[PDB]
Design a protein around this ligand. Structure first.
Ligand SMILES: CO[C@@H](CC(C)C)c1ccc2cc(-c3ccc(C[C@@](Cc4ccc(C(F)(F)P(=O)(O)O)cc4)(c4ccccc4)n4nnc5ccccc54)cc3)cc(P(=O)(O)O)c2n1
Ligand SMILES: [Mg+2]
Length: 289
């Protein structure tokens, strides 16, 4: 059905009336507000990249360690969509160990990186993975070893094969790393097409399947780009899982998601983009082949 003719014209209307800001601002001020007591404890000050961005206590990921179970990371659970994602900040020099420990304990098979290690002449993220096959990384603190196995570098993104080894249990797992390299902070992807392509690549890898732990998604703060990516994915599912795709209220879904982590999607443009990506993507996924 050409029911998308409405979604598209509706989108055109919002674009015509330039009401994206208002829509976006309305969502910010209606979003859930939950405690982040743990995040704010003095002993965890150095585990947070930013002062005002914190995981809610109720959905924070806990490290299975008696010393300190804290990591700035959130479990987002979407009921209807039937998908889970873990959103976290770009690892810090002192939290790379914690980061891979989380991947191991939560049984994640994939990691989606939407920022770059060097952003705007200031490294806004630590190099938490090996760049050379021969220079594997060892995290003494968590007793994990990580090795680059292969990497397919493309124009708008790179896909890597990594091997994570728990030195305690001596087990080894293959972790897929999906890096989107052209998404500036407080910005949008090169285009919906490149974005969706990257998204589909992640989907077909099986990294988002229920048989594994949730995929770990991160950018710099773990809320703008990460939130846009997850919102797009989740809404694509709902449109393909519901009788009437036009019944998918992205505003509503973002609010649902904002119950698990604060500030998901940081600019009105990112909201518009997620919208455009969901529409373009649904037409494809619903279109003939
Ligand atoms: C949960 O409930 C509420 C509650 C209270 C009012 C009680 C609540 C509680 C806390 C909140 C905090 C921020 C909220 C607070 C701060 C910021 C900007 C940021 C971090 C940040 C970086 C990159 C990205 C990104 F978008 F690029 P990425 O793609 O990487 O994610 C997102 C966020 C910062 C901006 C620019 C450079 C350096 C740091 N920063 N962090 N600390 C700072 C201290 C001084 C100056 C700037 C600071 C954004 C949202 C925003 C909101 P809001 O959007 O809901 O209004 C909040 N709401
Ligand atoms: Mg080499």
């Amino acid at each position: 059905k050409l029911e998308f003719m409405e979604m598209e014209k509706e989108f055109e209307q919002i674009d015509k009336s330039g009401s994206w800001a208002a829509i976006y601002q309305d969502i910010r001020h209606e979003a859930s507000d939950f405690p982040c007591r743990v995040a704010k404890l003095p002993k965890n000050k150095n585990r947070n990249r930013y002062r005002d961005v914190s995981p809610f206590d109720h959905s924070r990921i806990k490290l299975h360690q008696e010393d300190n179970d804290y990591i700035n990371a959130s479990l987002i659970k979407m009921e209807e969509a039937q998908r889970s994602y873990i959103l976290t900040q770009g690892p810090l020099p002192n939290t790379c160990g914690h980061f891979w420990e989380m991947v191991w304990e939560q049984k994640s098979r994939g990691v989606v990186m939407l920022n770059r290690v060097m952003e705007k002449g200031s490294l806004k993220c630590a190099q938490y993975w090996p760049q050379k096959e021969e220079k594997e990384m060892i995290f003494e603190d968590t007793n994990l070893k990580l090795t680059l196995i292969s990497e397919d570098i493309k124009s708008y993104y790179t896909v890597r094969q990594l091997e994570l080894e728990n030195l305690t249990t001596q087990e080894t797992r293959e972790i897929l790393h999906f890096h989107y390299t052209t998404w500036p902070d407080f910005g949008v992807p090169e285009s919906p097409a490149s974005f969706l392509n990257f998204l589909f690549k992640v989907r077909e890898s099986g990294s988002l399947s229920p048989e594994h732990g949730p995929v770990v998604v991160h950018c710099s703060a773990g809320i703008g780009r990460s939130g846009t990516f997850c919102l797009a994915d989740t809404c694509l599912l709902l449109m393909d899982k519901r009788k009437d795709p036009s019944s998918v209220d992205i505003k509503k879904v973002l609010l649902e998601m904002r119950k698990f982590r604060m500030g998901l999607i940081q600019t009105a443009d990112q909201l518009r983009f997620s919208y455009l990506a969901v529409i373009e993507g649904a037409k494809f996924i619903m279109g003939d082949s």
